[PDB]
């Protein structure tokens, strides 16, 4: 029993973290086989933060202008290239701790773990969701760029996020590992704002199923709803539309608990109307939306 915001074990990612310095700028890189991936703004100076031309900044650099440190060992850079918003630094040694891995681009509403690092060393690990507006609500300070987000499946690390920057509202933005930003953001210190964020409906429903699995039913009611009427109501509370694909994805949890998805939808409609009235659900006084249906099954079934 119990339900916690659980991250993946970080060991396999720890063994890939290095430090990259160009000039006086230092951030983190990811060392897989003989390539180090890092955010391209490591080549910026103080004159290059509003409108950097990264092609022009990079052509002025030689391999030996990049200092890569893995623990207390310097790695010699023997080539460099830019791919979208990331640099790829070829080094003369393959990382012997390279796990089996994949680069994936995730969708809004999917979760992942973050290993927050500074100067190539880890600070801690936490669980994140890609918000509908393509930001993440992380915990990142100056120097954390190049920290990564990831999922582990069996023995395979799926890297899905590289951290770049913080928006003025305090939320975070970054790229996939091919250097394409999530969202309509760019690596410039101009004013940029995300779309209005919304609540991840399919995740809230998964979490309500988790609460039932854990033995709590107080919030259910005798009603059902059409998908149409559910979405008309939920939208009024700034919730994301629920699709038939989402309904299908909730099938396993529905079958495990005996509660039809549209009956859980009717529960959620009443929770939004009423609030919790001094009660909590799985220890929270708000409706939680950063667990996916897979996260719930993983944690209530003990996947390792």
């Amino acid at each position: 029993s119990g339900f916690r915001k659980m991250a993946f074990p970080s060991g396999k990612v720890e063994g890939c973290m290095v430090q990259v310095t160009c000039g006086t700028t230092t951030l983190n890189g990811l060392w897989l086989d003989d390539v180090v991936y890092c955010p391209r703004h490591v080549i910026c100076t103080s004159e290059d933060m509003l409108n950097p031309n990264y092609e022009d900044l990079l052509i002025r650099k030689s391999n030996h202008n990049f200092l890569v440190q893995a623990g207390n060992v310097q790695l010699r850079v023997i080539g460099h290239s830019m791919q979208n918003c990331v640099l790829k630094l070829k080094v003369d040694t393959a990382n012997p701790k390279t796990p089996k891995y994949k680069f994936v681009r995730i969708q809004p509403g999917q979760t992942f773990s973050v290993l927050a690092c500074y100067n190539g060393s880890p600070s801690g690990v936490y669980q994140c969701a890609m918000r509908p507006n393509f930001t993440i609500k992380g915990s990142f300070l100056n120097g954390s760029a190049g920290s990564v987000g990831f999922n582990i499946d069996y023995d395979c690390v799926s890297f899905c996020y590289m951290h770049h920057m913080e928006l003025p509202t305090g939320v975070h933005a970054g790229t996939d590992l091919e250097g394409n930003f999530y969202g309509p953001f760019v690596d410039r210190q101009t004013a940029q704002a995300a779309g209005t964020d919304t609540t991840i409906t399919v995740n809230v429903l998964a979490w309500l199923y988790a609460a039932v699995i854990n033995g709590d039913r107080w919030f259910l009611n005798r009603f059902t709803t059409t998908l149409n009427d559910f979405n008309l109501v939920a939208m009024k509370y700034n919730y994301e539309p629920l699709t038939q694909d989402h309904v299908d994805i909730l099938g396993p949890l529905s079958a495990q608990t005996g509660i039809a998805v549209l009956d859980m939808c009717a529960s959620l409609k009443e929770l939004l109307q009423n609030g919790m009235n001094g009660r909590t659900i799985l220890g929270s006084a708000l409706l939680e939306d950063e667990f996916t249906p897979f996260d719930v099954v993983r944690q209530c079934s003990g996947v390792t």
Binding site: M49, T190, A191
Partner: peptide, 6 residues
Amino acid sequence: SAVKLQ
């Protein structure tokens, strides 16, 4: 306000 590259 401005974005901060980290």
